[PDB]
Write an enzyme that holds these catalytic residues in place. Sequence first.
Site, PDB file in Angstrom:
ATOM      1  N   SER A   1       0.827  -1.207   0.000  1.00  0.00           N
ATOM      2  CA  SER A   1       0.000   0.000   0.000  1.00  0.00           C
ATOM      3  C   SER A   1       0.864   1.262   0.000  1.00  0.00           C
ATOM      4  O   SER A   1       1.512   1.550  -1.000  1.00  0.00           O
ATOM      5  CB  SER A   1      -0.997  -0.030   1.158  1.00  0.00           C
ATOM      6  OG  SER A   1      -1.952  -1.053   0.943  1.00  0.00           O
TER       7      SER A   1
ATOM      8  N   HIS B   1      -5.761  -1.233  -3.141  1.00  0.00           N
ATOM      9  CA  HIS B   1      -7.146  -1.496  -2.763  1.00  0.00           C
ATOM     10  C   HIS B   1      -8.128  -1.111  -3.876  1.00  0.00           C
ATOM     11  O   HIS B   1      -9.256  -0.729  -3.584  1.00  0.00           O
ATOM     12  CB  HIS B   1      -7.525  -0.769  -1.462  1.00  0.00           C
ATOM     13  CG  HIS B   1      -6.500  -0.869  -0.369  1.00  0.00           C
ATOM     14  ND1 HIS B   1      -6.116  -2.070   0.190  1.00  0.00           N
ATOM     15  CD2 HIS B   1      -5.803   0.088   0.288  1.00  0.00           C
ATOM     16  CE1 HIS B   1      -5.218  -1.850   1.133  1.00  0.00           C
ATOM     17  NE2 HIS B   1      -5.008  -0.547   1.214  1.00  0.00           N
TER      18      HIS B   1
END
Length: 202
Positions: A120, A161
């Site tokens: 991320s 995501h």
Amino acid sequence: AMKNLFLTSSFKDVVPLFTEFESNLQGKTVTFIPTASTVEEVTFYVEAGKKALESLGLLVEELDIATESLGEITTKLRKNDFIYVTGGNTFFLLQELKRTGADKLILEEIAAGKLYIGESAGAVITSPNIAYIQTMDSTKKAVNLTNYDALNLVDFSTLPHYNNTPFKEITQKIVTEYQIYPISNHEAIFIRGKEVITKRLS
């Protein structure tokens, strides 16, 4: 020179893609950087990632860029086989990497052939500039960072995501507004030099 990167939204969700990417893991060591997560309020991914690494037989050594001397940062980065950067607030992460000059030390290690695992926030900082992530991660947590230019390891801007709840509307609006390279929770990007390949676990 060399560029070996494994980028993910959620390391714990793509462990088998990692073992496909890299062999003979037993006994190898990892500089594990959880700095991005230290200003975050919900951080399950940190331990999930650490335990996943340990389940592969890796020796995990923590390095918090925010608190450790440059001596320790330099030493650990040089000593250990891999570099792993957890998710969290991308702006705080980049801020601390720049403040210490460790962004430079990471680039040097990667150029020397060291494997970089970015989760991320840790994937986002491989892009040229992290401004695009500001609707996911608050800039309020980085009160010193004056320029959002990042590691610039790849020409593309990883968006983690992607179309994954609870970042559906967020990631959708980012694509519209902004070389965005979308990846979902069960996708990883394998990077070996100029060879860039998305893989999905399903």
